[PDB]
Design a protein around this ligand. Structure first.
Ligand SMILES: CNCc1ccc(-c2ccc3c(c2)[C@H](NC(=O)OC(C)C)C[C@H](C)N3C(C)=O)cc1
Length: 127
């Protein structure tokens, strides 16, 4: 059981709402990154067992990925848009913590992050 369980994606005890910013985060931000050429390593949790990287979860204690983020948005897990934005930022930061400059995965993360920032710079207004 070398991998940790994946992050929680649903919780019936948290209140739920739909906001225009949350719609944008799923329909524009997540979907645009998801289809990107470099999205695939980030579409599910890092499988440290299959990659045979037993130090990954020794280093990364707040894992996050777009598969999880997608489910969180679909399940109304986030109340505030910033909770979702923070999950994206955590995902990128983890990649930068574990890997090194010049690694293909870092270039991939940098490209996705630039696109992410372009899209959240056009986040719609709050209710
Ligand atoms: C059939 N399995 C396909 C697959 C292979 C590798 C990865 C994957 C996921 C996460 C990460 C990796 C691979 C990185 N390995 C690597 O060779 O990256 C290439 C593919 C760019 C290392 C690092 C721990 N990392 C992250 C996200 O930090 C995902 C799916």
């Amino acid at each position: 059981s070398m991998n940790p369980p994946p992050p929680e994606t649903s919780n019936p005890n948290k209140p739920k709402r739909q906001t225009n910013q949350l719609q944008y985060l799923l329909r524009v931000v997540l979907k645009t990154l998801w289809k990107h050429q470099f999205a695939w390593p980030f579409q599910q949790p890092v499988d440290a067992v299959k990659l045979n990287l037993p130090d990954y979860y020794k280093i990364i204690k707040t894992p996050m990925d777009m598969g999880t983020i997608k489910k969180r948005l679909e399940n109304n897990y986030y109340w505030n848009a910033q909770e979702c934005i923070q999950d994206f930022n955590t995902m990128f930061t983890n990649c930068y913590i574990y890997n090194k400059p010049g690694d293909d995965i870092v270039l991939m993360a940098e490209a996705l992050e630039k696109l992410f920032l372009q899209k959240i710079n056009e986040l719609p207004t709050e209710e």
